[PDB]
Design an enzyme around this catalytic site. Structure first.
Site, mmCIF file in Angstrom:
data_model
loop_
_atom_site.group_PDB
_atom_site.id
_atom_site.type_symbol
_atom_site.label_atom_id
_atom_site.label_comp_id
_atom_site.label_asym_id
_atom_site.label_seq_id
_atom_site.Cartn_x
_atom_site.Cartn_y
_atom_site.Cartn_z
ATOM 1 N N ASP A 276 -57.909 55.565 -16.074
ATOM 2 C CA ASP A 276 -58.480 54.223 -15.950
ATOM 3 C C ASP A 276 -58.067 53.543 -14.655
ATOM 4 O OD1 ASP A 276 -59.926 51.895 -16.658
ATOM 5 O OD2 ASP A 276 -58.105 50.961 -17.481
ATOM 6 N N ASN B 192 -48.227 60.341 -18.381
ATOM 7 C CA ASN B 192 -48.732 59.118 -19.012
ATOM 8 C C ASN B 192 -49.872 59.456 -19.954
ATOM 9 O OD1 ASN B 192 -48.915 55.927 -19.008
ATOM 10 N ND2 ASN B 192 -51.036 56.667 -18.826
ATOM 11 N N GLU B 193 -49.672 59.165 -21.239
ATOM 12 C CA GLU B 193 -50.712 59.284 -22.264
ATOM 13 C C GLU B 193 -51.342 60.677 -22.299
ATOM 14 O OE1 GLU B 193 -53.365 55.849 -21.926
ATOM 15 O OE2 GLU B 193 -51.865 54.636 -22.948
ATOM 16 N N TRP C 67 -48.822 45.642 -19.298
ATOM 17 C CA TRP C 67 -49.936 46.154 -18.528
ATOM 18 C C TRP C 67 -50.825 44.964 -18.241
ATOM 19 C CZ3 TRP C 67 -49.891 50.363 -15.982
ATOM 20 C CH2 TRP C 67 -51.065 50.856 -15.415
ATOM 21 N N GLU D 243 -46.625 49.614 -21.727
ATOM 22 C CA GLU D 243 -47.897 48.920 -21.566
ATOM 23 C C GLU D 243 -48.172 48.112 -22.821
ATOM 24 O OE1 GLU D 243 -51.277 51.224 -20.486
ATOM 25 O OE2 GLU D 243 -50.207 52.516 -19.064
ATOM 26 N N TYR E 40 -51.648 48.462 -27.872
ATOM 27 C CA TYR E 40 -52.607 47.397 -27.643
ATOM 28 C C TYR E 40 -53.020 46.774 -28.972
ATOM 29 C CZ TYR E 40 -52.670 48.937 -22.800
ATOM 30 O OH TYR E 40 -52.326 49.194 -21.487
#
Ligand code: USL
Ligand code: USL
Lengths: 596, 598
Positions: B170, B412-413, B549, B504, B469
């Site tokens: 992203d 990351n992820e 984030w 994040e 999130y």
């Protein structure tokens, strides 16, 4: 003079004439050619109520100088003629001539207060035309005041304007038109209620309502007082014009905790119901007392200003604005700089919002060499006579409102110059004479180098200051602003009477930011207010803070107006700036009573 | 080995940044050997910079494949007595470097430096330097690109006009000569090639263990000087390994930095290295810096500014650090790639703690038969592990001596909750621990997943770093639901007894949108989102850090959920504070760097 708010009752019809009317700009020949005697030809359509200036996209309409003509058909049932037929104009800005069919029924001066006229029944034909001519011109004789040279109040190189235009002596756009609703109502012909006056007495632990009922004709009078649920708590029949009623278990109207009784009045067949909050107001020493408790004002100067109606009555926005003030923790506002609609006043009574009620007197200043209060025959201001009528009319309209706690006689007149006291003495005397509740009176003080000569000191019950330490002076030097603020406000504090900010603020464009003091930024607006509060929070006679302004609003054009005035805590469409959240936090920690 | 090029009594440093010639490859640039001659019918392009946003052309911004940079290199002949090295701080993504039409080196990996000697026999009176730059990404690059023409962020299918990179991440695929190109020199016979420092505190005395890698034969000398210039340790003729001690050593602390000057000499060669003394240790649920329980306050960042894209921007680096000190932050993560050495050196000098991250974002093939991310390369799985090892080696080789670096982030992820994930990552963690002389903690940054108890980070990481999130990608505009679902999961992590943190969390926020009533994308919702998360995290004793984030809005690929890029910044792209930036200034002003959860 008496101006009861029109309501639908068992004896009174209420017909709202609002909607789409025909509309025609005058070209200089409108009266000569007697346009009011026929349908308007080659006309536009204009919403009523509304200001007309922003509805279209025409600069010539927006900036029109002079008269316009509104007109509509008025085809009413003949059985109305068995009643007394009244045409009520809640506001026509600035001056009006009203015609029914060919006939001039009334003329009014003053753009923010109601006027009415009977329609003689011999005039009502089968089909009728209602014509309203509206004058937008301002000068040294109108309130608000217009300048009579080519000067703008807000130029580097001189130029000749294309057309003549109004030059406001005030910082808001000259919105004009049929600002507030036009209504037809009826009463009984032969005996009817013309006015109601109510006052409260709280002495000896006994709450009483004192009434005085003004009538026309011969009949019997009755009065009953009812709770919100409809329980009768006091009543008397075949009463006099004046009297008193004891209210056992009386609940007081309080800021942010309203209580309204319903006071129903009978006179012959006529029936009128008036909401009424019971509360006391008084200034004692350095305290503003509401119901014998030391009040701290938290709020705003406002404007009646929304897009696209301009000054026009906008009842959804009224409700939204009160919701935002409660969300922010405010308890009050001032009707800057003119009386507001009765719909707003009545909603404030319902919601528990305290109001400083102000006249139309802005621009009473000729030297923002003839002095403002020189004799008229030498060029002095020509407003004093109309200023008295406005005070009379304002108090007559609003006297029964619990939410009104203080009258403001003028905004930023030339009160430090010679002759101001003599101009203002009769107006303060008049307001004290006319208000049955004898509420405190003030004028709102312009910022001024010789502030110790402000005649407010000799006249006012509360000193109300407009100050811009950190904006119009000390801009981007807040440390200097703090020092300059403390020096002057310690003088005011030393007088021992209540004083307060009725304006303070900083133009702030939503979306402009800087971590480092920069004018027009959202952060600077917060820092401006922090600096002022550093001082005011240390002064025991400072009893209130009303920011300038609740929300951004339209003004005349100029190099220092960024699409209007940008000092709102909210934007014109009511979105919070950084400083609006700052105030929500601050006002959440300050109680309505017993802060100082 | 990759020491930062500096000007010394033995080393020339010549910056080749400036206006270079630039030409898009049309499919024939290698066939017609554009690198053998002056580029013809070319543009000009600033170096360093990403080239995507410099002009107004979509075809330039969205170019697929190679481009050619070129400049003249007319160097003094005196330098032929020295060893001459061309250093490329970063070229994104892959590079082929030519001098006078001779290929000198190639490099894979867009965010770490590489160098090559210029052979003396290749240097003419006038020389051409040509750099070919490849922007293509796929299942074998880090970052990972998709090979299926679908968007990581359509309602009705369509055929694209031209073939384009499809990121599996992203952020916008900024490419070009991202960081400075420099020519430097060293002596020919004997020179310093690497320096490795570690430290140990004995009461108030620091022991600094050193290994000095060299080429050639000479005598090695090391000296340690205070900022003010006083020598406080010196040993001569020490060879490669050795140690020395500082009496009453000033330690490097977050927001209170102190750097010694370490001067090394080897024969004629001279090199000065700034060095801060500090300890890092995970102990229980504590992250100990200098034996005190740290609480992270900060952000994931991006290297992103307008118009240079990813390019080195030194005034903005100083501005960003100044904003983090204004806000009360103490730390950030280099999401999702190693940052410039100039930022890392500035963090050492300013006292900002860094979680240093590899380029490994997009290692996830499930973000004609279905495929598993970590299936065999033969069976279609991801092809990144060998490059992934090289990135870990080179990142630690570059950044090992930084006091500011306290933790390595391996990826990351990635797809860490599927089968094979542990087998992919265990060698990489073992590699990181073997090569870091300081043995700093290692983590992987954990994607939000339904089977979170199955995340292989539990088997591998010293700190559990979570991207979550609650209230944005789930429970959007239902912050009560967000608070309950946040608590349910974070209590699980808190029950493991090891330190964990947010790396994040945030909510897209367009500056200037407002509502008093909870509404996503408004400034008020950003604040309420964070307040709701802090209601939970503030009650969990193993939660040792919050990094939002993002620091600032940044550019991404185009899509229906990207409002001209990613809008989760506390600051706008031009570094203006949103409402939530002021909220965090207040919050971080009341939270200490040490002893918040003691
Ligand atoms: O260009 C300049 O330099 C100045 C310009 N103007 C005028 C507005 C163009 C000044 C005006 C002053 N008064 C005028 C209005 N008073 C209140 O202020 C609000 C506001 O101005 O925001 C109005 O909206 C309120 O209605 C009104 O009550 C403040 C004091 C002043 F003291 C200095 C300046 C300048 O210095
Ligand atoms: O996330 C995606 O990919 C898609 C998302 N949505 C969401 C509903 C937005 C799609 C919607 C489709 N409908 C398309 C047109 N409808 C008209 O359009 C206006 C508008 O959407 O602006 C509405 O306001 C009008 O009321 C309505 O008449 C809406 C819905 C669609 F065909 C595809 C998608 C996606 O593909």
């Amino acid at each position: 003079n008496a101006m009861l708010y029109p309501i639908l009752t068992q004896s009174r019809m209420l017909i709202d004439l609002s909607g789409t009317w025909r509309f025609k700009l005058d070209d200089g020949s409108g009266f000569e050619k007697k346009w009011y005697e026929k349908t308007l030809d080659d006309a536009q359509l204009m919403p009523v109520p509304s200001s007309y200036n922003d509805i279209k996209e025409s600069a010539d309409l927006r900036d029109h100088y002079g008269w316009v003509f509104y007109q509509r058909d008025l085809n009413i049932p003949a059985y109305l003629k068995t009643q007394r037929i009244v045409l009520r104009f809640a506001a026509v800005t600035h001056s009006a001539k009203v015609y029914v069919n060919g006939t001039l029924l009334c003329e009014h001066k003053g753009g923010f207060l109601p006027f009415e006229t009977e329609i003689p029944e011999n005039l009502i034909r089968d089909e009728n035309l209602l014509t309203v001519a509206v004058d937008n011109r301002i000068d040294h004789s109108t309130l608000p005041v217009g300048r009579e040279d080519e000067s703008n109040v807000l130029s580097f190189f001189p130029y000749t304007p294309t057309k003549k235009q109004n030059k406001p002596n005030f910082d808001f756009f000259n919105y004009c038109g049929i600002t507030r609703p036009v209504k037809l109502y009826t009463t009984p012909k032969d005996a009817y209620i013309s006015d109601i006056t109510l006052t409260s007495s709280l002495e000896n632990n006994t709450a009483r309502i004192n009434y005085k009922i003004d009538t026309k004709g011969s009949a019997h009078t009755a009065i009953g007082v009812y709770t919100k649920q409809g329980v009768c708590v006091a009543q008397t029949e075949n009463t006099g014009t004046e009297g008193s009623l004891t209210i056992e278990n009386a609940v007081l109207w309080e800021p942010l905790k309203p209580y309204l009784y319903e006071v129903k009045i009978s006179f012959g067949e006529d029936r009128y119901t008036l909401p009424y909050g019971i509360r006391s107001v008084a200034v004692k020493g350095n305290k503003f007392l509401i119901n014998n408790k030391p009040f701290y004002f938290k709020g705003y100067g406002k404007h009646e200003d929304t897009f696209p109606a301009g000054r026009g009555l906008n009842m959804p926005m009224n409700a939204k604005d009160i919701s935002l003030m409660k969300w922010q923790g405010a308890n009050s506002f001032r009707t800057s700089h003119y009386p507001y609609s009765e719909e707003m006043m009545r909603l404030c009574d319902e919601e528990g919002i305290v109001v400083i009620d102000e006249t139309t007197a802005v621009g009473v200043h000729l030297n923002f060499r003839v002095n403002t209060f020189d004799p008229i025959e030498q060029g002095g201001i020509r407003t004093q006579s109309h200023h008295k009528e406005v005070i009379k009319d304002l108090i007559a309209r609003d006297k029964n409102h619990a939410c009104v706690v203080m009258w403001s006689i003028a905004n930023e007149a030339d009160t430090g110059s010679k002759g101001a006291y003599e101009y203002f003495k009769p107006l303060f005397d008049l307001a004290r004479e006319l208000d049955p509740q004898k509420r405190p009176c003030t004028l709102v003080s312009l910022q001024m180098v010789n502030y110790k000569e402000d005649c407010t000191i000799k006249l006012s019950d509360v000193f109300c200051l407009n100050r811009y330490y950190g904006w119009y002076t000390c801009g981007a030097d807040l440390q200097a602003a703090e020092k300059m603020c403390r020096e002057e406000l310690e003088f005011w504090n030393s007088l021992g009477k209540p004083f307060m900010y009725t304006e303070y603020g900083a133009d702030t464009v939503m979306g402009l930011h800087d971590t480092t003091d920069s004018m027009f930024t959202e952060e600077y607006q917060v820092e401006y207010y922090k600096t002022n509060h550093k001082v005011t929070d240390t002064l025991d006679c400072f009893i209130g803070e009303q920011v300038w302004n609740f929300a951004d609003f339209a003004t005349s054009q100029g190099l220092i107006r960024v699409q209007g005035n940008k000092k709102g805590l909210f934007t014109r469409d009511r979105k919070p700036k950084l400083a609006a959240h700052y105030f929500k936090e601050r006002w959440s920690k300050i109680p309505d009573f017993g802060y100082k």
